[PDB]
Amino acid sequence: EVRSVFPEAIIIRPSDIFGREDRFLNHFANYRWFLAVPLVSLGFKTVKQPVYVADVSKGIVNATKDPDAVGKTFAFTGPNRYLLFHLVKYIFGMTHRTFIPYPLPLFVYSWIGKLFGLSPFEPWTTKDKVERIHISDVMPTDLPGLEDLGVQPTPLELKSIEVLRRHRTYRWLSSEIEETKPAKTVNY
Amino acid sequence: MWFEILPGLAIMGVCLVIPGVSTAYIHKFTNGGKEKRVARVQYQWYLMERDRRISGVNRYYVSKGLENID
Amino acid sequence: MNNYIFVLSSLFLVGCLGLALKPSPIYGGLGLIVSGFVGCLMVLGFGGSFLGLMVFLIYLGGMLVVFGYTTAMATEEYPETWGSNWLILGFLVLGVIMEVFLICVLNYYDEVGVINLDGLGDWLMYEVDDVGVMLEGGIGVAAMYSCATWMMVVAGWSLFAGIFIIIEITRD
Amino acid sequence: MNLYTVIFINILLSLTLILVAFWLPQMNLYSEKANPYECGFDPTSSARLPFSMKFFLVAITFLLFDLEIALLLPLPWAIQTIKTSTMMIMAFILVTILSLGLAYEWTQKGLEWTE
Amino acid sequence: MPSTFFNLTMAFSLSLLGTLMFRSHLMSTLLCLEGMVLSLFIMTSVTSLNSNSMSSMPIPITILVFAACEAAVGLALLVKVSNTYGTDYVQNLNLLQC
Amino acid sequence: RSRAEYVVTKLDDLINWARRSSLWPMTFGLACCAVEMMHMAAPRYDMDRFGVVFRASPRQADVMIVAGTLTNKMAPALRKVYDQMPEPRYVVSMGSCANGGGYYHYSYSVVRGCDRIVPVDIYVPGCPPTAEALLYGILQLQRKIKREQKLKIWYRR
Amino acid sequence: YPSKETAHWKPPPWNDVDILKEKAVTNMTLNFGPQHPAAHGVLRLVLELSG
Amino acid sequence: MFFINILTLLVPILIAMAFLTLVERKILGYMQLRKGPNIVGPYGILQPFADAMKLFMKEPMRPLTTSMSLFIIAPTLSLTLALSLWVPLPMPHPLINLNLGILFILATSSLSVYSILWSGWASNSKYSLFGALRAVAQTISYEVTMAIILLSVLLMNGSYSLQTLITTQEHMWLLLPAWPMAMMWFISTLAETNRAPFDLTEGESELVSGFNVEYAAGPFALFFMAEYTNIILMNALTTIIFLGPLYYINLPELYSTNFMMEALLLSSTFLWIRASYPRFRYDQLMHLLWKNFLPLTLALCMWHISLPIFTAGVPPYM
Ligand SMILES: COC1=C(OC)C(=O)C(C/C=C(\C)CC/C=C(\C)CC/C=C(\C)CC/C=C(/C)CC/C=C(/C)CC/C=C(\C)CC/C=C(\C)CC/C=C(\C)CC/C=C(/C)CCC=C(C)C)=C(C)C1=O
Ligand SMILES: CCCCCCCCCCCCCCCCCC(=O)OC[C@H](COP(=O)([O-])OCC[N+](C)(C)C)OC(=O)CCCCCCCCCCCCCCCCC
Ligand SMILES: CCCCCCCCCCCCCCCCCC(=O)OC[C@H](COP(=O)(O)OCCN)OC(=O)CCCCCCCCCCCCCCCCC
Ligand code: SF4
């Protein structure tokens, strides 16, 4: 509809954005308030490449200023693709909290997401939220991206501790970057 | 002036006389026009249990006088 | 209202288990305060209130001084609680499971030995003077002033010599 | 039973108050919100470090004096004894010994704080 | 009473086990000693109340008095240990082997 | 309109009444403007009569009266004690220094207004503003947070 | 009778007073102010305290 | 009916606490040549409700370094122990009639000290640690002195119950026989309640806020309610023990009215003292309570051991 009305609209498609006030890293860190982490198929066969919020905002500003960005669709993705299991494992490792994964089928996971979503305030999760969690990220091949808009994609390993240090306890509060093993990346 | 304190003082006074007066009235109401019996010793507790058995309604405060004696 | 004393005894056992498991001495003093309160309740249920309130007050003062001391010198940067170590928490839940298993074993195998669940709540108060004044527990401790003056003087000399002893130890 | 009931009512009331205090207002917490307070600057060291106690001898003396209090507390039942002379002499001896211990510590500067 | 006394005996056994199995904190060892003391007091008090032995009721108070003197001396010794080493570590209190 | 909208508006009025009748400032000041602030605390104007009582810790504070020159060396501390205040918090800049630098606007070591560091709700002008003017700013802040419609916006979401 | 497990031992001192390494005094460092009622608003009193 | 009795004790005590906060504001203002709150409500009488609602609709703080379990446990413990200490007081009939009433009072007061200590340690901050250690020293001094004071007074009374204190003061106040230890008991109650000049734990000028410097909103409200309920509690205990209200068997309303008037006078005296005096130094408080009060308390304890013996006025057991 936006392309039909405004034909030269710059359409920016980012991946799951992570940041200080996000609902991605903070969401997976707030999974610690329950007993386990109910991932679908144990978090495998689900690939994600999250993108930093400052990278997305720099891309948007450079799209305001860029003469060659008009009428294009950009794909804003992070430099590394992770499986969902390894991503959640890295998140809980940075939190130093614990890690107990649990394979939960998608229909009952959507059921409990709906149960959380029937809330008058901001829900903790929804059926659409868990579906977007377990949808894999496509590989951007033909679309331009942050490099074509002049932004270097900062890695999650570099910008992770500014988000997840809040979710630690006092024992692990003063833990550095190098004390957490980075997650394994996948080329696909 | 200094008498503007008196509304809050009066509210405090009412809220301090309510618990004691209400406790006395509730004791009197629940013990049937008499004060709640104090059993500080086993003798007084035994008196209370004997009255409870004597009354025949399982209430110690229902006292029986000379109407039970021929 | 029958297993009330048994529930209190189990809580006392759990508090002593935590104290044995030895968290940071702040939590150790907390567990000892809870155990002292539970023991005060047990003495209250079994009889006179004076002994329970006395041990409660004594342990409140004692763990106050212990709290001051463990903030002074027996502290660490990351104080250790029951949940900070997997081994300590595992020993805690294993001790709870072992307590349940042992009371079930004594209920079934040993029949009426030390633990009887059917007989629980039947043998708490054995014999009481139904009619009688001067029966409370503080009167014996008062009789220490008259009947056991030797007990009074050895306790008083213990406190006096203890004052001299602590002054000489911390004289430095 | 009544005392247990009113203690439980107090427990329920305070738990309800703290529960509604934690679940009623809007939450917005971040790192600088929950960092510890040191008058506007970062804490130089953790507050779990050893913190010297200058009245430790007075605290030990407080332990001994509290047990002297525990000894003195059965006096309102002790004054009902037949042999009031023995009770009076023993109570006088106990209080005099306690006072002599306090006087000796005061003389030996145990009540004064270190440094 | 017998189940309660068995639980109190097991509480004393746990506190003695804690005393005999040291960790790094001498203060925690002293707390285990005080737990043993508390179990002894509760056992003596419930025995006296069960047997109506008002003549033996001064005995638990005497136990508390002497045990508090023990705890006082232990705190003074812990003060001396901390002045020597900076901590109350029983691993620091080890140089008397030779 | 709907019956529930009226109930939500009345609840908004109740919450705003509580928050404007209980405004506790942080015991925080920097200069001559803070001298006028304690002259507002003084018996003539009686912020305590208005319900306004100083609390030393920022955790118990509701409003922050930036009263004085915010320097570069002071700005991290001011931001820290602002961030440590709980969420229903407000900022009253007081005096020309806290407003826009004032007499030290072109100085190397002065933040040109505390609105570069913290979001300011109400600006009180003067050098110093009188305690009358600071009290006027406090009452204006009370009216401003009386105007808030949080539950109504939440219902209309 | 020295062995491998006791060859590292030293004889005790003649006066039973061992030379120990001088432990560093860990004094608490406090930021008295600037957000303090007694600090007059803009004083960062770094206080080195023993107790 | 017993639950209704619980309600009609608990709720009026809470409202009296809130209006004690209001009356402290008004009395301190009028002693400081100002007015205090008269805008929020007719004469300021809605100000405590405004403050309570604001605090319970402000978000609480959960600091990263803070032990969450004890941080939560301490304020609810403080409020529960305040109401528990309120429960056995006779006016002239207690809700819960105990034999060792003052021993219950002493145990519950020491447990409230533990609530303060655990709050100060759980809030992992240096000012909170200072507040906890100052609380330790303060409760050492007032605990030993107040215990000996209460022992001497009840030796004059004869038993640990408080209806017995009413019967003791049926004809005359205990202030006349025991006025020096009444003064020392009043100072001990000030130190117990942490009121100026012996507050020293919520040190406004020395520390920032002391033990509750990391507490915000709801738990801070719980601490404030516990403290002011303890103020009314200790003044009520003082007027029950020393200034015996007129008790008549046919009507207890006169006793309740006289008790209310004397308790209000003692609470107003607390506010008056806070206005009048500067704060002690916390080593000077210990030196005071251990060098001036304690020797005189031991001497007066020996005197009250001797006095019924040589006057044959040994009090009855019941
Ligand atoms: C010259 O150099 C300089 C200085 O050097 C001198 C400086 O200093 C300096 C810095 C300057 C400043 C920071 C300025 C600060 C100003 C001052 C220092 C002067 C002001 C004076 C004071 C602060 C002293 C105030 C004294 C008082 C006596 C006021 C009283 C204050 C109190 C805190 C105590 C009263 C308590 C409260 C207000 C809160 C009480 C209420 C509650 C918490 C409510 C609790 C109640 C409930 C929860 C009850 C609920 C239960 C129910 C049942 C209710 C039912 C409810 C229903 C809805 C039904 C600068 C910059 C400077 O240049
Ligand atoms: C509840 C009933 C009413 C109680 C009083 C309530 C109204 C008055 C309240 C006043 C405000 C108090 C605010 C806090 C004050 C804190 C300071 C303070 O009090 O310090 C204590 C001060 C301390 O004085 P000081 O500290 O200044 O003294 C210096 C002492 N050195 C040098 C060692 C440091 O006084 C006392 O300790 C005295 C306590 C009361 C003594 C009463 C003795 C009466 C007489 C006994 C009998 C005498 C005759 C014997 C027989 C002879 C036979 C021939
Ligand atoms: C947040 C956690 C808080 C944990 C701590 C709770 C503290 C509660 C308040 C302080 C209590 C201090 C200790 C009191 C012990 C009992 C005092 C006493 O003297 O009780 C005796 C009394 C009757 O005895 P007596 O006076 O001789 O009368 C006989 C003839 N009328 O009465 C009796 O015999 C009744 C015996 C029971 C009385 C105590 C009931 C306590 C109930 C449990 C509270 C904790 C529940 C667990 C935690 C819940 C979740 C947090
Ligand atoms: S605006 Fe003027 S009066 Fe206020 S702080 Fe600046 S120089 Fe001082």
Coordinates of C-alpha atoms in Angstrom, one line a residue, chain A:
Chain A
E1 CA 0.0 0.0 0.0
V2 CA 2.8 2.4 0.8
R3 CA 4.4 1.6 -2.6
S4 CA 1.1 2.2 -4.3
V5 CA 0.5 5.5 -2.7
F6 CA 4.0 6.9 -2.5
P7 CA 5.9 5.1 -5.3
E8 CA 9.4 6.3 -4.2
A9 CA 9.1 5.3 -0.6
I10 CA 12.3 4.0 1.0
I11 CA 11.3 0.7 2.6
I12 CA 13.7 -0.5 5.4
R13 CA 13.3 -4.1 6.6
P14 CA 15.4 -4.7 9.7
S15 CA 15.8 -8.0 11.5
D16 CA 15.0 -8.5 15.2
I17 CA 16.4 -5.3 16.7
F18 CA 18.3 -5.6 19.9
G19 CA 19.1 -2.7 22.2
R20 CA 18.8 -1.4 25.8
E21 CA 15.0 -1.1 25.7
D22 CA 14.3 -3.8 23.2
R23 CA 11.9 -6.7 23.4
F24 CA 14.3 -9.3 22.1
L25 CA 17.3 -9.5 24.4
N26 CA 15.3 -8.3 27.4
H27 CA 12.6 -10.8 26.4
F28 CA 15.0 -13.8 26.4
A29 CA 16.6 -12.5 29.6
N30 CA 13.2 -12.3 31.2
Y31 CA 12.7 -15.9 30.3
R32 CA 14.8 -16.5 33.5
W33 CA 11.8 -15.6 35.7
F34 CA 10.3 -19.0 34.7
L35 CA 11.7 -22.5 35.4
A36 CA 13.0 -23.3 31.9
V37 CA 13.3 -21.8 28.4
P38 CA 10.6 -23.4 26.3
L39 CA 12.1 -23.3 22.8
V40 CA 10.4 -24.9 19.8
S41 CA 12.4 -27.9 18.6
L42 CA 15.0 -27.0 21.3
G43 CA 15.8 -23.8 19.5
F44 CA 17.3 -25.5 16.4
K45 CA 16.3 -25.0 12.8
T46 CA 15.6 -21.3 13.5
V47 CA 18.3 -18.8 12.3
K48 CA 18.4 -15.2 13.4
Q49 CA 20.8 -12.3 12.7
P50 CA 19.8 -9.5 15.1
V51 CA 20.8 -5.9 14.3
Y52 CA 21.8 -3.2 16.7
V53 CA 19.3 -0.3 17.2
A54 CA 22.0 2.3 16.8
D55 CA 22.9 0.7 13.5
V56 CA 19.3 0.8 12.4
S57 CA 19.0 4.4 13.4
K58 CA 22.2 5.4 11.6
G59 CA 20.8 3.6 8.5
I60 CA 17.6 5.5 8.7
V61 CA 19.4 8.9 9.1
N62 CA 21.7 8.0 6.2
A63 CA 18.6 7.1 4.2
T64 CA 17.3 10.6 4.9
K65 CA 20.5 12.0 3.6
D66 CA 21.3 9.5 0.8
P67 CA 20.5 10.4 -2.8
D68 CA 20.8 6.8 -4.1
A69 CA 18.4 5.3 -1.5
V70 CA 15.2 6.6 -3.1
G71 CA 12.7 3.9 -4.1
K72 CA 14.8 1.1 -2.7
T73 CA 14.2 -1.7 -0.2
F74 CA 17.0 -2.2 2.3
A75 CA 17.6 -5.2 4.5
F76 CA 19.1 -4.3 7.9
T77 CA 20.8 -7.3 9.4
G78 CA 23.6 -8.0 11.8
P79 CA 26.9 -9.5 10.7
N80 CA 26.4 -12.9 12.2
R81 CA 23.6 -15.4 11.9
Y82 CA 22.9 -17.6 14.9
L83 CA 20.6 -20.6 15.7
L84 CA 18.0 -19.7 18.2
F85 CA 19.4 -22.3 20.7
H86 CA 22.9 -20.8 20.5
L87 CA 21.5 -17.3 20.7
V88 CA 19.5 -18.0 23.8
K89 CA 22.4 -19.9 25.3
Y90 CA 24.7 -16.9 24.7
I91 CA 22.1 -14.6 26.2
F92 CA 21.8 -16.7 29.4
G93 CA 25.6 -17.0 29.4
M94 CA 26.0 -13.2 29.4
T95 CA 23.4 -13.0 32.1
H96 CA 25.3 -15.8 34.0
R97 CA 21.9 -16.9 35.3
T98 CA 21.4 -20.5 34.3
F99 CA 20.4 -22.4 31.2
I100 CA 17.7 -25.1 31.1
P101 CA 16.2 -25.4 27.6
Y102 CA 13.0 -27.3 27.0
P103 CA 11.5 -28.6 23.7
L104 CA 7.9 -27.3 23.4
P105 CA 5.8 -27.9 20.4
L106 CA 4.6 -24.8 18.5
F107 CA 0.9 -25.3 18.8
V108 CA 0.9 -25.4 22.6
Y109 CA 3.6 -22.7 22.6
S110 CA 1.2 -20.5 20.6
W111 CA -1.5 -21.5 23.1
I112 CA 0.5 -20.2 26.1
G113 CA 1.5 -17.2 24.1
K114 CA -2.2 -16.4 23.6
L115 CA -2.7 -17.0 27.3
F116 CA -0.1 -14.4 28.1
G117 CA -1.4 -12.1 25.4
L118 CA -4.9 -11.9 26.9
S119 CA -3.8 -9.1 29.2
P120 CA -5.2 -5.6 29.5
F121 CA -1.7 -4.1 29.8
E122 CA 1.3 -4.7 27.7
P123 CA 1.6 -8.5 27.5
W124 CA 4.8 -10.4 28.2
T125 CA 4.3 -12.4 25.0
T126 CA 1.7 -13.1 22.4
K127 CA 1.0 -15.8 19.8
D128 CA 2.3 -13.5 17.1
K129 CA 5.3 -12.9 19.3
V130 CA 6.2 -16.6 19.6
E131 CA 5.5 -17.1 15.9
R132 CA 7.9 -14.3 15.0
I133 CA 10.4 -15.8 17.4
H134 CA 10.3 -19.1 15.7
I135 CA 10.3 -17.8 12.1
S136 CA 13.8 -18.0 10.7
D137 CA 15.4 -15.0 9.2
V138 CA 15.8 -15.1 5.4
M139 CA 19.3 -14.5 3.9
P140 CA 19.4 -11.0 2.2
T141 CA 21.1 -11.6 -1.1
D142 CA 19.8 -9.0 -3.6
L143 CA 18.7 -6.3 -1.2
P144 CA 21.1 -3.6 -0.2
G145 CA 21.9 -3.1 3.5
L146 CA 23.7 -1.2 6.2
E147 CA 27.0 -1.3 4.3
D148 CA 25.3 0.2 1.3
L149 CA 23.8 2.9 3.5
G150 CA 27.2 3.5 5.1
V151 CA 26.8 1.8 8.5
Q152 CA 29.1 -1.0 9.7
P153 CA 27.0 -3.6 11.5
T154 CA 28.1 -3.8 15.1
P155 CA 28.1 -7.3 16.5
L156 CA 25.9 -8.6 19.2
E157 CA 29.0 -9.9 21.0
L158 CA 30.3 -6.4 21.1
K159 CA 27.1 -4.6 22.2
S160 CA 25.5 -7.4 24.3
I161 CA 26.7 -6.4 27.8
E162 CA 25.1 -3.0 27.7
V163 CA 21.7 -4.8 27.7
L164 CA 22.2 -8.0 29.8
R165 CA 24.2 -6.6 32.7
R166 CA 21.0 -5.4 34.3
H167 CA 19.6 -8.9 34.4
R168 CA 22.6 -10.3 36.3
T169 CA 22.7 -10.8 40.1
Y170 CA 25.2 -9.1 42.4
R171 CA 27.6 -12.1 42.2
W172 CA 28.1 -11.8 38.4
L173 CA 27.5 -8.1 38.1
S174 CA 31.1 -7.1 37.5
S175 CA 31.8 -9.6 34.8
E176 CA 33.7 -8.6 31.6
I177 CA 33.0 -9.4 28.0
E178 CA 35.6 -12.1 27.7
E179 CA 34.2 -14.2 30.5
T180 CA 31.3 -15.3 28.2
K181 CA 31.9 -17.7 25.3
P182 CA 30.4 -16.3 22.1
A183 CA 27.7 -18.2 20.3
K184 CA 28.5 -20.4 17.3
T185 CA 27.5 -18.7 14.0
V186 CA 26.0 -20.4 11.0
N187 CA 26.6 -19.5 7.4
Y188 CA 23.1 -20.4 6.3

